[PDB]
Write an enzyme that holds these catalytic residues in place. Structure first.
Site, PDB file in Angstrom:
ATOM      1  N   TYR A 228      -6.040  16.520  -6.717  1.00 21.34           N
ATOM      2  CA  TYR A 228      -5.251  15.471  -7.892  1.00 21.34           C
ATOM      3  C   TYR A 228      -4.293  16.395  -8.500  1.00 21.34           C
ATOM      4  O   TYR A 228      -3.098  15.849  -8.839  1.00 21.34           O
ATOM      5  CB  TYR A 228      -6.442  14.465  -8.528  1.00 21.34           C
ATOM      6  CG  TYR A 228      -5.572  13.348  -9.327  1.00 21.34           C
ATOM      7  CD1 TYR A 228      -5.381  12.317  -8.942  1.00 21.34           C
ATOM      8  CD2 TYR A 228      -5.772  13.587 -10.610  1.00 21.34           C
ATOM      9  CE1 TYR A 228      -4.565  11.241  -9.678  1.00 21.34           C
ATOM     10  CE2 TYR A 228      -5.311  12.646 -11.558  1.00 21.34           C
ATOM     11  CZ  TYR A 228      -4.930  11.383 -11.095  1.00 21.34           C
ATOM     12  OH  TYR A 228      -4.444  10.360 -11.868  1.00 21.34           O
TER      13      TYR A 228
ATOM     14  N   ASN B  23       1.118  -1.264  -0.088  1.00 20.02           N
ATOM     15  CA  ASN B  23      -0.099   0.116  -0.021  1.00 20.02           C
ATOM     16  C   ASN B  23       1.127   1.116   0.086  1.00 20.02           C
ATOM     17  O   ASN B  23       1.441   1.448   0.869  1.00 20.02           O
ATOM     18  CB  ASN B  23      -0.859  -0.166   1.200  1.00 20.02           C
ATOM     19  CG  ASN B  23      -1.829   1.171   1.145  1.00 20.02           C
ATOM     20  OD1 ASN B  23      -1.772   2.184   0.427  1.00 20.02           O
ATOM     21  ND2 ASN B  23      -2.755   1.178   2.257  1.00 20.02           N
TER      22      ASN B  23
ATOM     23  N   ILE C 288      -7.438   7.618 -20.905  1.00 16.30           N
ATOM     24  CA  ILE C 288      -7.189   6.172 -21.410  1.00 16.30           C
ATOM     25  C   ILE C 288      -7.986   5.065 -21.058  1.00 16.30           C
ATOM     26  O   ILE C 288      -8.674   5.190 -19.553  1.00 16.30           O
ATOM     27  CB  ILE C 288      -5.715   5.665 -20.961  1.00 16.30           C
ATOM     28  CG1 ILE C 288      -4.658   6.749 -21.164  1.00 16.30           C
ATOM     29  CG2 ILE C 288      -5.460   4.246 -21.268  1.00 16.30           C
ATOM     30  CD1 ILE C 288      -4.193   6.961 -22.582  1.00 16.30           C
TER      31      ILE C 288
END
Lengths: 240, 247, 243, 247
Positions: free
Chosen positions: C154, C62, C187
């Site tokens: 982000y 992780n 994508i």
């Protein structure tokens, strides 16, 4: 053999970057047409390529002279050569401080380094469009992005090439044609070399093969989703 | 009143961005030389500015004719007007798909938008260097950075303007001359007025602010970069486009 | 085929871009260590890769958990695996308008998508430096450069990945280590109508890309022939953003 | 005086860039709230400004600490201060080679320079949207775009500031709020004063004029972007670095 049955045109393919680009493309199965300003060089290119086991054709072309361009294309037409991949490698510098720079130095560099991309791409693009596939790749320079004193004309041309390429990329995308620029930093082609490389993170000057490998990557089918981009190959001297 | 002692040259200063730029610099106290294609327009500009109480000269200048450039700099020479601030406003478009574009459409744009900057910069740089102060500011375009189909010529020229300015900024920086580009997005102007209802609407979809700019937006950015307080900004491109393109 | 004897680590290699990247590197003869957050996924990865005749190892990681990272590197060490190629692929989104965005949505994204880059490279750089060869490549995003509403966290992270890479490139360049970013556009890997609209209007061809598009670019950067490319961001986005 | 009746917030306004920014905004008419990490520096700020004839308030803020941020906004609300203009100037470096860098060095820098942007913007954006007007201006760094060895954390942070700002620009653009970054190059400050004579000299080789900028240089760009005539500029990074980096 990604490029079997593709025909590639590399201008100024005699030596340095041009030749390596020609070598790299032929290595992927492409048929390569390389140009030089003299017949003798066009022959040297042709025989040297065919000597390494490649199908190549050397032709005479001065990309600064519209008559030469016009004759050049009448010949590939006569030889039944359709261009699928265009590499605008040829160019020239006329360095001067802007204030002393003449009209001839300014105009020569704009004409040779910028207008030539328009003129060459104009003559290749309809073919690629009909076949619904093509690559246009132009050799820029780090100075087109970073600027450099003594080169107002060269920097202007090189920046203009990027502008041209981004715009064309929109126009030709629907036909699976990509349009990109490979911008070299300092590449081997005097030391001086030691000092130059202190301005380069990697501490070394690059080699023609560095540029060829990038051009060949962009020209391959696997870079099909890359368009309108500038790929800097410069050891970290400029990072976009 | 940073610019009280300065002389500004604004090309195509008759109306729109050119005129607001003139107004903006004069407002800061600059003496402003505005240029126009015709004597009447040049006279019109001069009278306009002087009416608002500014120090202004309107002269004839066609920026594609090397000969016209020559006559113009001789006239300011005799009038004892040395240029301290040059604002390149000049430029035209000849849009067309690249494959169809004519040699005239290509060369016209390169000459008028790109080659002009060199020609004009070359005539002003010596005086600025001599005084160890100058401002060169060129009106570029969002499409120079973003690209735009149908404008391979205009995009090349405007991108070229930036390359030229970056390079020149190095040569003159020691003489306290800065060289910068202001790149307008969609600004209300004579040229934009031409556009159809539809193409205005389409462009609207590309502007986060939901507003079309005004010439004052460009004038303000230009006048800021022209000021003494912008001394440490050189070689930069300032996008003024409501978020249409973010650098 | 130059990647024989090179060892590569691709985080989040279970599927999509990571899996295609693992497949691309393996295809050039690299030994690929792929990571997943669950033991089942790690094994599924490994079995799939080995299924195709590649040498591969699936491990649990992780990238957001420091202890997990610490255990991971303890494990690769005990397995005598020296990492020559690091591909930072793993990440997450917690989308929201900035004003409603929680401290937790902000922090999780910075932590998982930016700090992870620092933490994984810090564990790999010493090996590369001693062998005087390395590649670090992080999967960024078009939004890191273009920005995108609803993703302040982000976009901040993916823009920071670029800042980090440029800085790091300077530090390791002399040891023949390159550090680059591949920034995918859209994508195909559940598309929102907005995303579909953005596809339709912002991509010149109006086509979404594929995982192989990103894998080819990563593999190209990872190859010896890209030795002179460092500090760069390679945009693979169909022309949706042109730097 | 486009800033009459506006209230601006400058984090870390004690000295250097922060203080000149505060000074520059007040000169355009803004009421300025400045922050310091200490009650003594907070007062010193308020005293210095009000001395120069300005309407100012200095409050304590440890911007690394969310509880401190929470108490600060509690305080300005109690005091009737609605922020129209936010300038994020607070930030620190913890330089080290990446391979030697501790978790403290990394996170301290990310938290202070990047997470602080989100935290402060989150507390100002509502009132700006309600009023349909606002400015958010963050002070980045040249190394955010150019990269720099020994500063992986700082370069990461400052590049993140630009990504955050571009993203936020889209969200608020339609409510007449602009979001921009001013990215200083080499400017005379306290940390700069900590460089050896030789470090300074070496850096001079990277600036075309060879001049080190001053806090007024940054304050001037910030105040411009904050002004009403900068209304059509958003999502942009304005590099103020003497040509050290051209974008």
């Amino acid at each position: 053999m990604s490029l079997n049955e593709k025909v590639a045109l590399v201008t100024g393919a005699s030596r340095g970057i041009g030749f390596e680009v020609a070598h790299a493309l032929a290595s992927k199965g492409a048929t390569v047409v390389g140009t030089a300003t003299s017949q003798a060089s066009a022959e040297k290119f042709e025989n040297s390529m065919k000597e390494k086991g490649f199908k190549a054709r050397g032709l005479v072309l001065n990309i600064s002279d519209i008559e030469s361009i016009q004759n050049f294309f009448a010949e590939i037409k006569a030889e039944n050569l359709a261009i699928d991949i265009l590499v605008n490698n040829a160019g020239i510098t006329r360095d001067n401080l802007m204030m002393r720079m003449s009209e001839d130095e300014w105009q020569s560099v704009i004409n040779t380094n910028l207008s030539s991309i328009f003129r060459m791409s104009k003559e290749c693009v309809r073919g690629m469009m009909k076949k619904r596939w093509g690559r246009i790749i132009s050799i820029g320079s780090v100075v087109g992005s970073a600027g450099n004193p003594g080169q107002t004309n060269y920097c202007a041309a090189k920046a203009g090439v990027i502008g041209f390429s981004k715009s064309l990329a929109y126009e030709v995308a629907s036909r699976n044609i990509t349009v990109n620029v490979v911008a070299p930093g300092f590449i081997a082609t005097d030391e001086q070399k030691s000092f130059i490389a202190t301005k380069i993170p990697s501490g070394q000057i690059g080699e023609p093969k560095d540029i060829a490998a990038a051009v060949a990557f962009l020209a391959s089918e696997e870079a099909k989703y890359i368009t309108g981009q500038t790929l800097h190959v410069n050891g970290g001297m400029y990072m976009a």
